[PDB]
């Protein structure tokens, strides 16, 4: 529900909130598939990146809707380098407009100073490199694995 392909990145952490008719082993069984599926890549320093919640109340469904009733469901909050694709979209689009200074008067004429834009763009420029520094691998690591597609 953020529009990207997670295989362009690596996971930092994932968080799962379970609603209704759910039992803790059948989650431990469900996460095991996710750990083994190494094409779902985590950062090379995060071996068990899971957080989990389970709640006895289900989804409630509204009458004005098209969405079905279910016994069991989940919500998935996840931190990944697959959205760093998107920082590099915004900061590129910003550069095209600012290299012609387009629309800058509409923000200046309403009390922002111009140097604000440079600042926020430099915070994004540091951000770019913050995401480069977590996505690297360990120099102390090595690996051999039997499976070659996941």
């Amino acid at each position: 529900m953020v529009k990207c392909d997670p295989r362009h990145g690596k996971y930092m952490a994932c968080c799962l909130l379970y609603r209704g008719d759910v039992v803790p082993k059948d989650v431990n069984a469900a996460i095991a598939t996710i750990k083994t599926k190494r094409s779902i890549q985590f950062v090379d320093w995060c071996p068990t990146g899971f957080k989990v919640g389970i709640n006895y109340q289900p989804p409630t469904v509204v009458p004005g809707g098209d969405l079905a009733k279910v016994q069991r469901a989940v919500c998935m909050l996840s931190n990944t380098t697959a959205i760093a694709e998107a920082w590099a979209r915004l900061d590129h689009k910003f550069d095209l407009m600012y290299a012609k200074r387009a629309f800058v008067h509409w923000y200046v004429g309403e009390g922002m100073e111009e140097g604000e834009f440079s600042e926020a763009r430099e915070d994004m420029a540091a951000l770019e490199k913050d995401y480069e520094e977590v996505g690297v691998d360990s120099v102390e690591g090595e690996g051999e694995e039997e499976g070659e597609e996941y």
């Binding site: 600012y98 763009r121 420029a125 540091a126 995401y131 520094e133």
Partner: protein
């Protein structure tokens, strides 16, 4: 009856040098500086 080749009155005499020409524009902008950068989300000392 010879009128002595009478001249016109009064014409576009103020336009005889006029074209007119055009001015210039060149925009064109300066680069901002983004050289104040460093990352924080890693290690530079505790790696050792």
């Amino acid at each position: 009856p010879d009128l002595k080749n009478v001249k016109s009155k009064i014409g576009s005499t103020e336009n005889l040098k006029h074209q007119p020409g055009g001015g210039k524009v060149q925009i064109i902008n300066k680069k901002l500086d983004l050289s104040n950068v460093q990352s924080k989300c890693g290690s530079k000392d505790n790696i050792k």
